[PDB]
Each structure stands twice: as structure tokens, then as C-alpha cells.
Scaffold this active site. Sequence first.
Site, PDB file in Angstrom:
ATOM      1  N   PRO A 173     -23.692  34.690 -71.779  1.00 23.01           N
ATOM      2  CA  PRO A 173     -24.494  33.980 -70.890  1.00 23.01           C
ATOM      3  C   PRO A 173     -25.724  34.776 -70.556  1.00 23.01           C
ATOM      4  O   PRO A 173     -25.743  35.470 -70.689  1.00 23.01           O
ATOM      5  CB  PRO A 173     -22.768  34.009 -70.056  1.00 23.01           C
ATOM      6  CG  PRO A 173     -21.455  34.603 -70.484  1.00 23.01           C
ATOM      7  CD  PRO A 173     -22.961  35.290 -71.426  1.00 23.01           C
ATOM      8  N   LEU A 174     -26.111  34.144 -70.006  1.00 24.59           N
ATOM      9  CA  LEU A 174     -27.453  34.755 -69.427  1.00 24.59           C
ATOM     10  C   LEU A 174     -27.097  35.326 -67.775  1.00 24.59           C
ATOM     11  O   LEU A 174     -26.372  34.149 -66.994  1.00 24.59           O
ATOM     12  CB  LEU A 174     -28.805  33.818 -69.130  1.00 24.59           C
ATOM     13  CG  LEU A 174     -29.986  33.789 -68.138  1.00 24.59           C
ATOM     14  CD1 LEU A 174     -30.420  35.570 -69.221  1.00 24.59           C
ATOM     15  CD2 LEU A 174     -30.701  33.774 -68.280  1.00 24.59           C
ATOM     16  N   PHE A 177     -25.299  32.300 -65.844  1.00 24.08           N
ATOM     17  CA  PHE A 177     -25.816  30.850 -66.423  1.00 24.08           C
ATOM     18  C   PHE A 177     -24.762  30.972 -67.617  1.00 24.08           C
ATOM     19  O   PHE A 177     -25.416  32.382 -68.716  1.00 24.08           O
ATOM     20  CB  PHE A 177     -27.215  30.601 -66.458  1.00 24.08           C
ATOM     21  CG  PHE A 177     -27.585  31.140 -64.558  1.00 24.08           C
ATOM     22  CD1 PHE A 177     -28.541  29.193 -64.819  1.00 24.08           C
ATOM     23  CD2 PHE A 177     -28.304  32.010 -64.573  1.00 24.08           C
ATOM     24  CE1 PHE A 177     -28.841  29.878 -63.342  1.00 24.08           C
ATOM     25  CE2 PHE A 177     -28.900  31.905 -63.766  1.00 24.08           C
ATOM     26  CZ  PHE A 177     -28.983  30.774 -62.645  1.00 24.08           C
TER      27      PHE A 177
END
Lengths: 131, 131, 131
Positions: free
Chosen positions: C1-2, C71
Site C-alpha cells: 500500500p501507499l 491507501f
Amino acid sequence: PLIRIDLTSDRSREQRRAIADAVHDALVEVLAIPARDRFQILTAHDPSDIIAEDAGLGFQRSPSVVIIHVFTQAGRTIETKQRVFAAITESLAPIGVAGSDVFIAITENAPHDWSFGFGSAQYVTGELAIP
Amino acid sequence: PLIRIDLTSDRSREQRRAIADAVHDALVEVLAIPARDRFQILTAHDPSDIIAEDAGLGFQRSPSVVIIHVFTQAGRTIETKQRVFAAITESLAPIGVAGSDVFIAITENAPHDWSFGFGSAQYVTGELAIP
Amino acid sequence: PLIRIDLTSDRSREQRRAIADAVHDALVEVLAIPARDRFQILTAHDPSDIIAEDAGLGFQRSPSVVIIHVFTQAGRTIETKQRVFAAITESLAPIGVAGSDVFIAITENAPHDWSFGFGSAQYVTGELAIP
């Protein structure tokens, strides 16, 4: 909600904070969130870093754009979201942010997507009431 | 769409702006959004502040990473998004961004989650056409 | 994920990095994502530009708050998220980030919403396995 406010460093620190305060007053009035449900990240930029035109509506902005990105949980109606936009813009007008220079976006998630501290998801445990 | 472009300070102010120009032009081409539907936030970081690896795909990135976070309306097909990723990265190559140094993410919302200014939800009112 | 990690500029370069390391180690331990599935952007602010109260839960934070915005693609369970929130906070504790000072929010999308480089959507092509 978590609000990312990206604006320009040409604005004084005093006004930047007032913009933040304005946004929060508005969300509290419209959304009826707790007065202390305040979570904001103010990022100031050289105006060259913010590029915000009109999507062909037919108006120009000054360089002093203010972009407000609202991360909040799903559930709010379309009209409520309209109220938010109107409320924020109106509250920003007197503190030197023009309607032409406001851009607002909403991105939703769920109650279980939040930890307010201590490694706890307070909506899931019920320590914090869901709207 | 609102584009958050996070890159590194070693890149020239000129190059960044060019990076930003290329991403917009790519989106107009692939998404057929209005030409002036341009909304971008450029944040230049010390490269140490961006940590982007390869998720085990087996490649190396320079420190000069460029991360593109696209915030756009739901509805675009999986194939359209692929076209977006490829158009963006192909447009960045001549500008001085290797394919290895690009990272793109998409996060979706609804047409009623946007105010382009003046306190209005233009997609809702009909002031602005929906995709 | 970011991951967007937003913290305060008074924290040192080494502490910023350990904070980033602690958060990544947490996601690896709990989500079992690949060790190198690492994508983090760090932004340091004057503490006045990060505003995080308590939503009426009845506690106070220091100025040195750390907001972490994950995210990631949908699919993780509520319980798994609870475990993530826990892991992150417990990992950050000995790094000098108090439980009172951590705020976490999660925003989801799909596998086809990711390009890890080279103009390709790696979850779509099979080049990378859906986690």
C-alpha cells in the site's frame, strides 16, 4: 474527518490558521460532528506548485488557491455534501479566500477505517459514537 | 480529477512543471476530460522523505521517485486505467523520468463529491457535464 | 500500500526514518505484504500546521503528532485493521511516538488502481499477486 488543506505560502500564518478554523466551523455546523473532532493537515506551497483551472466553466482564479480535501466516512447525502461546500466557501469569504479560489473534494471510507489514538479503532469498539 | 504529484527536490522547478504538464496532457488524451479540467498539487521532497521500492518485482529505482496519486470519479474501466498508466509513463520518459521511477495510484469517489468553486457542486447542479 | 505519513519538522532525520520503518514493519507483520511492497511519502510541518484534537474522547496530545494515512486495496477485515492500528502504534512507541500522538486513517481502492512502474498495472497483468 481528516482534512488536507493545501494552500499558498504567500498567505500569512495567521490567515492559514483562520482558513483551517473556518473549514472546521463549517463542517461542525453542517455535519454535526463533535466540536473536537478536528483533524487537519495544512500544507503551504509556492503558488506555482498549485495548478487549479476551471474545467471549462469560464472563470479565472488568483494564484492564492485553496484546495480542501475531505476524508470522511460514507453515509452523508448528496444535499448534505452540497451544504458542506456552500458552508465552507461562505465561511472562507470574509477571511480573504475568494469563491473562485476554492476547490473541494470528498473521499469516503468506513468507521472501521479510523484510529484516533492508542492503536484503537474507537468507532468499532463503540468508545466513540458513529454519526 | 485532482492529481497529487509528489516528487523530489533534486528535480528542477522547470522539470517538475513539465512533469505536471505531461501528466495532465496524458489524462486529457486517455480520459477525454475537459482541457482545463486541471487540478494538481506538486510537493517536492528531499528524496529521503520518499521511500518507494519494488514490491519484489526485481528492479531498482533512482532516488528521484515520482508518485502520482489520481483522485477521480468512479466509472472508468480497468482497460482505460491501464491506458492511463501507460500514457503517463510514456510521456514522462523524454522529460527525464525513467519508467522505474514512476508510481501511480488511483482513488475513486462520486460526481457529487466535487466543488470546483463558488460553493457549488457543479456536477450535481448540471453546471458541468458528467463523464 | 501507499502510506502518507505527516509529522512535525522538529523530529530528526533519523527519527523520521525509524518512524517510517516502524510503520512498514507493522504492515508486513500484520498484512503479510511483501517486504519490499514499500511506498511511503513523508511530509514534515511546523506543529501549528498539524491539528489533531481528540473528538471528545477525553485525552490530550503533544505537539509532535504523527498522522498516518494508509491507501491500500480493499479486502482486509475489520479485525485485521484493528490489528494494524495496534501494530503500528506498538511499533512506534519505542521510536518516541506516544500512543496519544498517533492518528490513522485508511482509504481503499482496487488492484487495477495500481501502477508500480513501467506504465504497467501489475496486479492486472499477473506480474504481481493479489495480496
